[PDB]
Design a protein around this ligand. Sequence first.
Ligand SMILES: CCCCCCCCCCCCCCCCCC(=O)OC[C@H](COP(=O)([O-])OC[C@H](O)COP(=O)([O-])OC[C@H](COC(=O)CCCCCCCCCCCCCCCCC)OC(=O)CCCCCCCCCCCCCCCCC)OC(=O)CCCCCCCCCCCCCCCCC
Ligand SMILES: CCCCCCCCCCCCCCCCCC(=O)OC[C@H](COP(=O)([O-])OC[C@H](O)COP(=O)([O-])OC[C@H](COC(=O)CCCCCCCCCCCCCCCCC)OC(=O)CCCCCCCCCCCCCCCCC)OC(=O)CCCCCCCCCCCCCCCCC
Lengths: 171, 459
Amino acid sequence: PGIVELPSLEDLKVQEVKVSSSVLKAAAHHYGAQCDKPNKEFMLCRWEEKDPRRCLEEGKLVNQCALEFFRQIKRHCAEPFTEYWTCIDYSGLQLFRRCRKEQAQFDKCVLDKLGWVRPDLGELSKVTKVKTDRPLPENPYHSRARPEPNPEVEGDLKPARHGSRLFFWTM
Amino acid sequence: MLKYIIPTMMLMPLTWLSKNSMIWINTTLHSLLISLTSLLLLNQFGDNSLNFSLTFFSDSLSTPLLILTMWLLPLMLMASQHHLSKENLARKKLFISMLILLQLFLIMTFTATELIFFYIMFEATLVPTLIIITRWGNQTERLNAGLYFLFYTLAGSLPLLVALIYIQNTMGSLNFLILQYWVQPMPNSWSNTFMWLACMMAFMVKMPLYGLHLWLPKAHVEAPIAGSMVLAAILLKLGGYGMMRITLLLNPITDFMAYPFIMLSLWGMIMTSSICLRQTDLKSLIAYSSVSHMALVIVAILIQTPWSYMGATALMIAHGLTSSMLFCLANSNYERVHSRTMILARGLQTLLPLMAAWWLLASLTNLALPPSINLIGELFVVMSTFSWSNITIILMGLNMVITALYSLYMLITTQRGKHTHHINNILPSFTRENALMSLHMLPLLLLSLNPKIILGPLY
Ligand SMILES: CCCCCCCCCCCCCCCCCC(=O)OC[C@H](COP(=O)([O-])OC[C@H](O)COP(=O)([O-])OC[C@H](COC(=O)CCCCCCCCCCCCCCCCC)OC(=O)CCCCCCCCCCCCCCCCC)OC(=O)CCCCCCCCCCCCCCCCC
Ligand SMILES: CCCCCCCCCCCCCCCCCC(=O)OC[C@H](COP(=O)([O-])OC[C@H](O)COP(=O)([O-])OC[C@H](COC(=O)CCCCCCCCCCCCCCCCC)OC(=O)CCCCCCCCCCCCCCCCC)OC(=O)CCCCCCCCCCCCCCCCC
């Protein structure tokens, strides 16, 4: 068949969020609140295109806005955040429940110096609507023309011509 | 034909609702009324057959076979009511029911407009015949007589079925009235060759053909008298009737594939007549004579000329009456001496003079005495086969020698000479037996006055 078309390596280069998983998970609720819009535009493009090659620019927007989030944490509240993700990072399952006092200090410093509310129980699991300008993918499965179906049954059902016509049976 | 099928079916309540002693008289009376009704089938025309419905029609071929078939039933009821005198009343009604059922299957075998209905009735006639032979026979060898009669016939006919269904897929119809007008020439190929063999070998078995005839000396001597009458009288003529219906489809392949069957029959009518010269059994002698006579009908059908078909249908009707009379005469000896040995009871013209007159007349109609329809059929077949090949008159004429030399020897052994001294239960001839002889012979002599009703669709 045809050639598979991959993007070039310079099309994939972007400043990655080079932090560990506990740094992410410790800031995860504030990241889900503040970085809502480009993340939801990207996941919308990712489920609608069903092709990662048509979703690279929204991924670059995600990778930019996540860095903007961690910079805005770093400008103001780097030390309560650092101590909080260190406490989260200690645990093996990375429990939130073991580290509620550093969470209280981080939430208070973030709320005071940046004006961010942590999302409550239930909110980040909501299905939200997204206002994008890109068109709807008319053929995301890259399908072709379905075959024409068989002609249906129509017309009044007339009685059988001369019975059954089985060798001699006149009915 | 539904004015003959319904009275024949209504003979079943007429034999199963009767008094315990009236069942022969009631069935005899109403079967004679149906036989008198059977003359309404003689509305025949020189061009168009008498075409009743989509299911049934009757030309001038099936009409004499129908008259003979509906006439045979009272004669079988008269012949069979002596050895079934000690029989259980329920088994007696069963025997009469098998005769009635076999008559029904025969009278809607000959009238089948469509050939697979012909096949179904043509192979439905085995079952009451088989039950009659194997149940109300007399000897140990009746059981084997039910096997050779059966598994020859189906060996011919279960191919025929397939071939008939091939025509149902090819022409679209097995109607004989359609297939007169949609018939196509059957060319020379191996497919059409085995088509011909499948269309013909079933009827070759039921004629019988020489070589295939081995079921018949076993099925006639082991049946009761009504069974021997229905085999020799009618059930050998299903083969000739089916051949005359089926060789319409088989042209021009009949004109080169029917050579060995003509050879088999022209030599088998010599060989079975020679066997009749040396049979120690009287009923076997009549059986081999039946093979000898039906070989002429096989030859006359396979040469397919008009004189041959007219002689073949006249010979079929004449041989039905004559062979039925000869088996009834052998029965008239067997019910007194209790042995079928031909040399046993000799000189019976001294003891039974009127019965010796009936033996004389039946043997004269066996040897084709003119102007009987025996001689008319014999003679027309000999004319057409002289037209076929000029040498065949030898094989005809030599046969007409030997056909006399067992017709009178059977007369001279059983009726002439000194009577056997150690046999003294030779009763006088019953009025039943003489009535049976006269009901066989008097139509066979009246048809000499008017043979044109038994000369087929092309008189
Ligand atoms: C105002 C409103 C009211 C009006 C009322 C009007 C009616 C009043 C009366 C009502 C009662 C019914 C009367 C009969 C109606 C007509 C049926 C008929 O005769 O069809 C002829 C039918 C076809 O002839 P036709 O000339 O083309 O048409 C005439 C009619 O117009 C046929 O017309 P059709 O085209 O419409 O016919 C349709 C088709 C036409 O037929 C065909 O297309 C041909 C193929 C049919 C099947 C063939 C199968 C062959 C292989 C198996 C053979 C088995 C053995 C045979 C029997 C042995 C004994 C059991 O038939 C069938 O499909 C049915 C199958 C056959 C059954 C017939 C009815 C029987 C009823 C009584 C049963 C009693 C036992 C009968 C024997 C049992 C076996 C049938 O003939 C045959 O098929 C041959 C067999 C004979 C038929 C049955 C005879 C019934 C009377 C028997 C009296 C004596 C009984 C003694 C005891 C039992 C026997 C031991
Ligand atoms: C539509 C109406 C038509 C009416 C006309 C009739 C048409 C033909 C019907 C049947 C004719 C023959 C019947 C008699 C023989 C069977 C009975 C018997 O044993 O008789 C002996 C017995 C006399 O003997 P008995 O002393 O009283 O006691 C017995 C003896 O002890 C012991 O017996 P035996 O030793 O004394 O007797 C043996 C002796 C032995 O003699 C012979 O066998 C010699 C005769 C045959 C060879 C020579 C002639 C060859 C052919 C030439 C002649 C025909 C063509 C002539 C025309 C010109 C040329 C073309 O046979 C005779 O005497 C019988 C003479 C007649 C024989 C006819 C030919 C049969 C031979 C085989 C077939 C041949 C081809 C077919 C012929 C068809 C003729 C139409 O006769 C009777 O008692 C007669 C009873 C009543 C018979 C009625 C027959 C007709 C029934 C039809 C009913 C429905 C229609 C109403 C008309 C009724 C008219 C009355």
